[PDB]
Amino acid sequence: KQFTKCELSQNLYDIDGYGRIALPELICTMFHTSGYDTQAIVENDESTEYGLFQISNALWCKSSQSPQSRNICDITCDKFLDDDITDDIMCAKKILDIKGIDYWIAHKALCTEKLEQWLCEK
Ligand SMILES: [Ca+2]
């Protein structure tokens, strides 16, 4: 499932100021990250990143591809490919708590200027 900008900001409302992050900032980031597609799958070196949040199996979830993964979010990477982004969000919170938003390269890159384009309400 692909989200529209507003449908997502909607579902992620209670994330604003979460860890001193700005919603628009985070929306901007997801856009460049997966284009808001829940089924986004990206193979990197050996490893892969999954879902809207493109959370890596090198460290965050468990995949047969990287048995040695620390599986910090303690979940199978397959859970990041369904139409329920709840679990995804819990993993995302975990990343934010431990790593920070710089886990996502698009942040520093393009989402710290004109986050205007990233607001919705109507
Ligand atoms: Ca999910």
Side-chain angles (χ1 to χ4, degrees):
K1 174 162 179 167
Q2 272 228 297
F3 296 103
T4 201
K5 196 234 330 240
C6 264
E7 114 202 52
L8 206 287
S9 193
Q10 268 196 58
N11 287 331
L12 303 195
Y13 205 56
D14 229 278
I15 89 204
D16 185 49
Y18 185 91
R20 27 131 59 120
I21 71 138
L23 170 65
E25 189 150 67
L26 182 143
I27 296 299
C28 171
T29 308
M30 303 311 129
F31 168 68
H32 300 273
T33 302
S34 61
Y36 318 131
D37 187 343
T38 68
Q39 280 159 231
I41 299 182
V42 187
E43 243 257 4
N44 307 251
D45 9 282
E46 319 250 296
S47 65
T48 316
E49 277 137 70
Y50 307 94
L52 178 136
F53 297 126
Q54 274 304 269
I55 118 43
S56 192
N57 59 177
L59 200 96
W60 306 105
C61 53
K62 122 254 266 83
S63 164
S64 71
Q65 180 175 251
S66 300
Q68 1 105 107
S69 178
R70 271 189 183 128
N71 188 194
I72 303 346
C73 296
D74 194 38
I75 185 182
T76 161
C77 304
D78 90 78
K79 297 303 299 222
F80 300 160
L81 305 168
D82 59 15
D83 60 23
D84 182 18
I85 64 167
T86 313
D87 43 17
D88 299 50
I89 282 169
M90 289 324 277
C91 181
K93 273 181 184 137
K94 244 175 194 255
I95 297 159
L96 291 157
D97 287 347
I98 300 156
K99 163 85 90 306
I101 208 194
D102 287 314
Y103 162 84
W104 296 273
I105 178 196
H107 191 241
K108 353 161 177 184
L110 298 169
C111 322
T112 63
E113 21 189 60
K114 85 204 215 161
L115 269 13
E116 239 236 84
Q117 71 138 276
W118 314 100
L119 290 134
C120 164
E121 229 92 353
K122 257 218 172 179

